[PDB]
Amino acid sequence: VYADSFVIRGNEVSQIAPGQTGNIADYNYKLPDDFTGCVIAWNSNKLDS
Amino acid sequence: LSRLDPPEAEVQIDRLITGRLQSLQTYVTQQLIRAAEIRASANLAATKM
Amino acid sequence: LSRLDPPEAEVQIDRLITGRLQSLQTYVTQQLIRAAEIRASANLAATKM
Amino acid sequence: RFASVYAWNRKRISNCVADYSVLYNFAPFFAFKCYGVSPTKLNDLCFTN
Amino acid sequence: RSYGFRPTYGVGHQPYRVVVLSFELLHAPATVCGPKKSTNLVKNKCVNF
Numbered sequence: 680v681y682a683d684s685f686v687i688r689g690n691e692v693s694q695i696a697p698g699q700t701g702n703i704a705d706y707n708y709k710l711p712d713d714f715t716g717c718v719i720a721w722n723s724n725k726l727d728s
Numbered sequence: 729l730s731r732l733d734p735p736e737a738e739v740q741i742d743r744l745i746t747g748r749l750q751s752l753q754t755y756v757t758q759q760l761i762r763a764a765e766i767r768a769s770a771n772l773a774a775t776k777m
Numbered sequence: 778l779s780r781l782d783p784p785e786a787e788v789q790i791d792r793l794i795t796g797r798l799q800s801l802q803t804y805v806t807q808q809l810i811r812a813a814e815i816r817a818s819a820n821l822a823a824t825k826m
Numbered sequence: 827r828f829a830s831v832y833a834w835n836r837k838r839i840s841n842c843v844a845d846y847s848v849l850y851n852f853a854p855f856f857a858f859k860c861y862g863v864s865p866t867k868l869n870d871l872c873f874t875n
Numbered sequence: 876r877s878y879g880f881r882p883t884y885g886v887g888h889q890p891y892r893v894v895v896l897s898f899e900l901l902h903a904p905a906t907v908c909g910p911k912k913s914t915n916l917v918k919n920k921c922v923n924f
């Protein structure tokens with residue numbers, strides 16, 4: 680199992696998905712087109728801003 | 729392909745591949761009957777000769 | 778069945794059932810023509826006898 | 827100010843180069859749901875109005 | 876470039892924390908497994924393995 684973790688903006692959360700492109704899915708973190716796994720995202724405004 | 733992301737492109741073109749294969753199978757199915765119809769007449773012509 | 782829940786299992790296996798039925802139908806369709814081809818020769822052999 | 831529902835306004839956009847990645851910074855929306863076209867390739871198409 | 880995470884921003888601009896879990900379901904010696912208990916091994920009889 681491989682676990683990756685980072686912090687992004689709420690706008691770009693939809694860009695962490697296979698076949699997606701954008702500002703964050705092009706130059707920062709790109710998922711493979713045949714991904715087999717899970718993605719978890721939660722709000723952290725009270726401790727990261 | 730130019731208007732839909734591959735996640736949905738592989739669903740859209742999957743509805744064309746099956747239809748075109750169904751279109752293609754009927755052609756050979758009818759040719760396989762026309763061939764036997766022609767073969768009967770060819771055998772009759774050979775006997776007459 | 779072991780990796781996908783029933784709501785999507787009945788969608789995944791529904792794409793295999795139709796394909797296997799289509800695969801099975803062509804077999805009998807071609808056998809129904811080979812049988813007639815054989816029957817013609819059987820009739821000819823009976824006449825020759 | 828935004829117009830009321832019973833008197834919704836319509837604005838025509840034409841004769842300009844449209845970049846759809848800039849409107850992400852213009853409003854704090856989250857979904858951006860599209861029906862007839864994937865939002866990924868909206869920048870690769872030419873419309874008439 | 877750097878973010879500007881502040882409490883003033885609303886939803887869609889607030890920071891989000893993301894964790895991605897990646898598996899791979901192939902035929903190879905497995906190390907990580909779920910919490911299930913093994914049983915004894917029976918042979919030469921029709922069983923569910």
Ligand SMILES: *[C@@H]1O[C@H](CO)[C@@H](O)[C@H](O)[C@H]1NC(C)=O
Nearest residue numbers: 848849850851852853854888
């Ligand atoms: C909206 O317009 C106002 C006035 O022109 C400006 O102060 C503000 O920065 C603009 N906001 C965005 C997100 O463009």
